GROMACS .gro file of C-alpha atoms in nm:
model
  230
    1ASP     CA    1  -0.902  -2.489   3.595
    2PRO     CA    2  -1.262  -2.570   3.478
    3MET     CA    3  -1.247  -2.292   3.210
    4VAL     CA    4  -0.914  -2.435   3.057
    5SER     CA    5  -1.084  -2.782   3.057
    6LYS     CA    6  -1.390  -2.681   2.843
    7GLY     CA    7  -1.275  -2.507   2.521
    8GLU     CA    8  -0.951  -2.700   2.542
    9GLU     CA    9  -1.142  -3.033   2.568
   10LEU     CA   10  -1.304  -2.967   2.223
   11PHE     CA   11  -0.957  -2.971   2.071
   12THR     CA   12  -0.798  -3.285   2.218
   13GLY     CA   13  -0.802  -3.518   1.915
   14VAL     CA   14  -0.840  -3.478   1.539
   15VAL     CA   15  -1.124  -3.234   1.458
   16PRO     CA   16  -1.275  -3.220   1.105
   17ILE     CA   17  -1.277  -2.870   0.947
   18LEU     CA   18  -1.499  -2.703   0.683
   19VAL     CA   19  -1.403  -2.372   0.519
   20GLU     CA   20  -1.641  -2.161   0.294
   21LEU     CA   21  -1.535  -1.837   0.128
   22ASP     CA   22  -1.730  -1.601  -0.095
   23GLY     CA   23  -1.502  -1.347  -0.262
   24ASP     CA   24  -1.535  -1.045  -0.487
   25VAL     CA   25  -1.210  -0.868  -0.582
   26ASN     CA   26  -1.247  -0.574  -0.826
   27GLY     CA   27  -1.587  -0.739  -0.928
   28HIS     CA   28  -1.414  -1.071  -0.999
   29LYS     CA   29  -1.646  -1.304  -0.804
   30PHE     CA   30  -1.543  -1.640  -0.670
   31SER     CA   31  -1.627  -1.911  -0.412
   32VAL     CA   32  -1.396  -2.139  -0.232
   33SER     CA   33  -1.470  -2.456  -0.031
   34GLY     CA   34  -1.221  -2.623   0.202
   35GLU     CA   35  -1.209  -2.956   0.393
   36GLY     CA   36  -0.953  -3.106   0.625
   37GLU     CA   37  -0.872  -3.160   0.990
   38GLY     CA   38  -0.687  -2.990   1.275
   39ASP     CA   39  -0.496  -3.146   1.567
   40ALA     CA   40  -0.422  -2.869   1.810
   41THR     CA   41  -0.213  -3.108   2.029
   42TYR     CA   42   0.053  -3.076   1.755
   43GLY     CA   43  -0.047  -2.727   1.624
   44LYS     CA   44  -0.125  -2.903   1.304
   45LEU     CA   45  -0.376  -2.827   1.022
   46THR     CA   46  -0.420  -3.014   0.689
   47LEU     CA   47  -0.664  -2.855   0.438
   48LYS     CA   48  -0.762  -2.878   0.076
   49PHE     CA   49  -0.933  -2.580  -0.092
   50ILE     CA   50  -1.123  -2.581  -0.420
   51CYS     CA   51  -1.237  -2.298  -0.641
   52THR     CA   52  -1.587  -2.418  -0.713
   53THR     CA   53  -1.662  -2.132  -0.954
   54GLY     CA   54  -1.373  -2.204  -1.194
   55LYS     CA   55  -1.038  -2.024  -1.204
   56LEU     CA   56  -0.936  -1.847  -0.891
   57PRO     CA   57  -0.889  -1.477  -0.997
   58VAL     CA   58  -0.618  -1.407  -0.739
   59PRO     CA   59  -0.304  -1.610  -0.639
   60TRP     CA   60  -0.374  -1.891  -0.391
   61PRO     CA   61  -0.081  -1.774  -0.157
   62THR     CA   62  -0.274  -1.449  -0.110
   63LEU     CA   63  -0.566  -1.636   0.059
   64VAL     CA   64  -0.359  -1.854   0.297
   65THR     CA   65  -0.397  -1.623   0.598
   66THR     CA   66  -0.770  -1.586   0.535
   67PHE     CA   67  -0.827  -1.960   0.507
   68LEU     CA   68  -0.798  -2.123   1.222
   69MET     CA   69  -0.594  -2.001   1.516
   70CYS     CA   70  -0.797  -2.224   1.758
   71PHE     CA   71  -0.569  -2.507   1.628
   72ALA     CA   72  -0.251  -2.340   1.760
   73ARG     CA   73  -0.047  -2.553   2.000
   74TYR     CA   74  -0.036  -2.367   2.326
   75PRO     CA   75   0.239  -2.503   2.553
   76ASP     CA   76   0.117  -2.612   2.897
   77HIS     CA   77   0.268  -2.299   3.070
   78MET     CA   78   0.064  -2.086   2.825
   79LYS     CA   79  -0.292  -2.244   2.832
   80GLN     CA   80  -0.436  -1.943   3.026
   81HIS     CA   81  -0.358  -1.725   2.715
   82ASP     CA   82  -0.544  -1.926   2.456
   83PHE     CA   83  -0.823  -1.689   2.354
   84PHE     CA   84  -0.921  -1.893   2.057
   85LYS     CA   85  -1.019  -2.213   2.234
   86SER     CA   86  -1.171  -2.025   2.520
   87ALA     CA   87  -1.440  -1.873   2.283
   88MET     CA   88  -1.554  -2.214   2.174
   89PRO     CA   89  -1.791  -2.382   2.098
   90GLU     CA   90  -1.982  -2.056   2.032
   91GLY     CA   91  -1.683  -1.928   1.837
   92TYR     CA   92  -1.546  -1.596   1.735
   93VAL     CA   93  -1.544  -1.331   1.466
   94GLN     CA   94  -1.212  -1.272   1.287
   95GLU     CA   95  -1.191  -0.956   1.081
   96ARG     CA   96  -0.898  -0.829   0.870
   97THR     CA   97  -0.788  -0.562   0.632
   98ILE     CA   98  -0.488  -0.680   0.430
   99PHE     CA   99  -0.300  -0.396   0.245
  100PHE     CA  100  -0.098  -0.514  -0.054
  101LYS     CA  101   0.188  -0.266  -0.090
  102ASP     CA  102   0.135  -0.053  -0.412
  103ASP     CA  103  -0.176  -0.248  -0.492
  104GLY     CA  104  -0.524  -0.317  -0.361
  105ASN     CA  105  -0.668  -0.435  -0.031
  106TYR     CA  106  -0.876  -0.728   0.103
  107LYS     CA  107  -1.133  -0.678   0.381
  108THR     CA  108  -1.238  -1.002   0.542
  109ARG     CA  109  -1.499  -1.112   0.787
  110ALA     CA  110  -1.501  -1.466   0.917
  111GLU     CA  111  -1.698  -1.658   1.179
  112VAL     CA  112  -1.519  -1.943   1.335
  113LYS     CA  113  -1.732  -2.186   1.531
  114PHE     CA  114  -1.848  -2.540   1.590
  115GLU     CA  115  -2.127  -2.693   1.386
  116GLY     CA  116  -2.177  -3.021   1.568
  117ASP     CA  117  -1.832  -3.186   1.583
  118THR     CA  118  -1.709  -2.987   1.277
  119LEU     CA  119  -1.503  -2.675   1.319
  120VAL     CA  120  -1.637  -2.425   1.064
  121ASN     CA  121  -1.469  -2.115   0.907
  122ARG     CA  122  -1.722  -1.907   0.708
  123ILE     CA  123  -1.562  -1.619   0.521
  124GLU     CA  124  -1.666  -1.310   0.318
  125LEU     CA  125  -1.383  -1.132   0.135
  126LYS     CA  126  -1.398  -0.800  -0.052
  127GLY     CA  127  -1.097  -0.677  -0.260
  128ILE     CA  128  -1.095  -0.318  -0.400
  129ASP     CA  129  -0.838  -0.099  -0.577
  130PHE     CA  130  -0.634  -0.369  -0.735
  131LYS     CA  131  -0.426  -0.312  -1.049
  132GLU     CA  132  -0.566  -0.533  -1.326
  133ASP     CA  133  -0.205  -0.601  -1.422
  134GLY     CA  134  -0.041  -0.596  -1.080
  135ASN     CA  135   0.108  -0.883  -0.881
  136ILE     CA  136  -0.233  -1.005  -0.759
  137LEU     CA  137  -0.482  -0.978  -1.058
  138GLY     CA  138  -0.185  -1.042  -1.288
  139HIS     CA  139  -0.091  -1.370  -1.105
  140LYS     CA  140   0.280  -1.280  -1.051
  141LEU     CA  141   0.323  -1.445  -0.705
  142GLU     CA  142   0.511  -1.772  -0.673
  143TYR     CA  143   0.335  -2.078  -0.526
  144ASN     CA  144   0.524  -2.099  -0.195
  145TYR     CA  145   0.511  -1.946   0.152
  146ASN     CA  146   0.751  -1.807   0.414
  147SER     CA  147   0.743  -1.870   0.789
  148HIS     CA  148   0.627  -1.582   1.003
  149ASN     CA  149   0.556  -1.492   1.371
  150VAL     CA  150   0.213  -1.335   1.436
  151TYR     CA  151   0.196  -1.105   1.749
  152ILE     CA  152  -0.124  -1.121   1.957
  153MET     CA  153  -0.243  -0.852   2.194
  154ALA     CA  154  -0.550  -0.813   2.414
  155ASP     CA  155  -0.821  -0.567   2.332
  156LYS     CA  156  -0.995  -0.559   2.679
  157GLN     CA  157  -1.220  -0.274   2.566
  158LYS     CA  158  -1.364  -0.507   2.295
  159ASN     CA  159  -1.347  -0.829   2.509
  160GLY     CA  160  -1.118  -0.967   2.237
  161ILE     CA  161  -0.780  -0.952   2.070
  162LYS     CA  162  -0.580  -0.757   1.808
  163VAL     CA  163  -0.315  -0.904   1.575
  164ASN     CA  164  -0.088  -0.701   1.339
  165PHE     CA  165   0.167  -0.864   1.101
  166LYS     CA  166   0.336  -0.863   0.753
  167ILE     CA  167   0.351  -1.145   0.500
  168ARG     CA  168   0.603  -1.110   0.213
  169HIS     CA  169   0.487  -1.312  -0.088
  170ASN     CA  170   0.765  -1.406  -0.334
  171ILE     CA  171   0.719  -1.242  -0.679
  172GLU     CA  172   0.833  -1.439  -0.990
  173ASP     CA  173   1.103  -1.175  -1.073
  174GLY     CA  174   1.269  -1.260  -0.740
  175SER     CA  175   1.125  -0.955  -0.560
  176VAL     CA  176   0.863  -0.955  -0.272
  177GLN     CA  177   0.501  -0.834  -0.248
  178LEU     CA  178   0.424  -0.702   0.100
  179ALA     CA  179   0.086  -0.775   0.255
  180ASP     CA  180   0.028  -0.577   0.574
  181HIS     CA  181  -0.233  -0.754   0.787
  182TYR     CA  182  -0.455  -0.587   1.048
  183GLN     CA  183  -0.676  -0.820   1.251
  184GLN     CA  184  -0.943  -0.803   1.524
  185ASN     CA  185  -1.115  -1.110   1.692
  186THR     CA  186  -1.421  -1.091   1.919
  187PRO     CA  187  -1.614  -1.373   2.085
  188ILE     CA  188  -1.955  -1.464   1.939
  189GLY     CA  189  -2.099  -1.565   2.283
  190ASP     CA  190  -2.173  -1.366   2.597
  191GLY     CA  191  -1.956  -1.574   2.833
  192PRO     CA  192  -1.611  -1.528   2.989
  193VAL     CA  193  -1.306  -1.567   2.765
  194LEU     CA  194  -0.930  -1.583   2.822
  195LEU     CA  195  -0.781  -1.240   2.747
  196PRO     CA  196  -0.418  -1.306   2.685
  197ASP     CA  197  -0.082  -1.147   2.766
  198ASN     CA  198   0.112  -1.036   2.456
  199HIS     CA  199   0.261  -1.342   2.287
  200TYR     CA  200   0.299  -1.462   1.933
  201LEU     CA  201   0.207  -1.762   1.719
  202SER     CA  202   0.480  -1.905   1.498
  203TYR     CA  203   0.351  -2.023   1.160
  204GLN     CA  204   0.502  -2.253   0.898
  205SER     CA  205   0.301  -2.315   0.581
  206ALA     CA  206   0.356  -2.552   0.292
  207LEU     CA  207   0.150  -2.525  -0.026
  208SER     CA  208   0.117  -2.823  -0.266
  209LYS     CA  209  -0.117  -2.965  -0.534
  210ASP     CA  210  -0.333  -3.280  -0.530
  211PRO     CA  211  -0.195  -3.479  -0.832
  212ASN     CA  212  -0.543  -3.616  -0.902
  213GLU     CA  213  -0.727  -3.285  -0.878
  214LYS     CA  214  -0.821  -3.109  -1.203
  215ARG     CA  215  -1.006  -2.819  -1.049
  216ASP     CA  216  -0.826  -2.504  -0.935
  217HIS     CA  217  -0.716  -2.583  -0.579
  218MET     CA  218  -0.460  -2.555  -0.299
  219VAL     CA  219  -0.338  -2.814  -0.046
  220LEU     CA  220  -0.228  -2.632   0.276
  221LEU     CA  221  -0.025  -2.780   0.565
  222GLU     CA  222   0.031  -2.549   0.863
  223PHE     CA  223   0.206  -2.600   1.197
  224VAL     CA  224   0.130  -2.325   1.447
  225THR     CA  225   0.285  -2.287   1.800
  226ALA     CA  226   0.222  -2.017   2.062
  227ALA     CA  227   0.540  -1.871   2.224
  228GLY     CA  228   0.683  -1.549   2.380
  229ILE     CA  229   0.574  -1.605   2.738
  230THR     CA  230   0.876  -1.779   2.895
   0.00000   0.00000   0.00000
């Protein structure tokens, strides 16, 4: 299938990644830069993010979802459902609203696309209605991350897809902070894309620190595998 060959073929080996995020949450401004590489053959991403403006004003775990579904490992039987690769190299727009239960919300807009041989994720994030002393602005979330399936559905009417899902961030008291994610992706280009059958991506994420890094940062390792079409 000459469509499956093209976007897919961009993803065959190790691809370098660049991430740039400008954030403003309750008027707390911040910028984040990320570098790393994805290997979609194994569903694997390795990234390191740096707050280049000083202290990150929100917990790192809260940004994990915002900081590359084109690096999902689609099994062979499922290649005709890989929206993300099919939009490349011209890329796609990923938008979200993330509702933190009993606290504020993030609204995100990202463009994911190739710049030469680099896969680039450019992000704007706005956070409003946060409690100065809540779980987020009050830095009460633990530095860890639970595994989660993400359920993808087509949005034919927008030539794109819709994703809805919940993350539960561990609070330091042992409780959980719910973060209800609503997502919409649309291709950047005018060409055909693969509009998928309902399926899900399975995510595992591991958060660590670079022992030699003194800036505020996060090391992220993610394995992501499409399933649900047997």
